[PDB]
Amino acid sequence: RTRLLDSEIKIMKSEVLRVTHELQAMKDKIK
Amino acid sequence: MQIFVKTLTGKTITLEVEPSDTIENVKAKIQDKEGIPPDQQRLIFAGKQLEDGRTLSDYNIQRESTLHLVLRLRGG
User: Where in the cell is it found (chain A)?
Assistant: First the structure.
């Protein structure tokens, strides 16, 4: 198991972008 | 290590961080120097947007590289 730690870094970074993604649409609907 | 935070006001901010630190800790350090909360802070490295969920190493941010500082600008 070598690339399992590198592919988990790509999953954890994009999943944190989804936290700002739902926050992007939740903020756009007020204005 | 030291890094550079360059504003658009011609002002350069230096911070002592570690390469494994998250971006929100760096924004907390910016709040420690300035008092601006991190939701009003935006950081750009070589034209790329920084996300608080990742580290400096994820964007290959190293010793004394130059950031950009743009502020949240909402009106009304």
Answer: Cytoplasm; Nucleus
Cβ contact, residue pair A20, B58, below 8 Å? no
- Helix, coil or strand: residue A29: coil
User: Which 8-state DSSP code applies to residue A23?
Assistant: H
Resolution, expressed in angstroms to one decimal: 3.0
In chain B, where the domains are located = 1-76
Q: What is the DSSP code string of chain B?
A: -EEEEEESSS-EEEEE--TT-BHHHHHHHHHHHH---GGGEEEEETTEE--TTSBTTTTT--TTPEEEEEE-----
Is A16–B58 a contact, with Cβ atoms under 8 angstroms apart? Answer: no
Residues of A whose CB is below 8 A from B53: 12-13, 15-17, 19-20
How far is it, in rounded angstroms, from Cα B51 to Cα B44? 10
> What is the experimental method?
cryo-EM
Structure tokens at A19: 């936290």
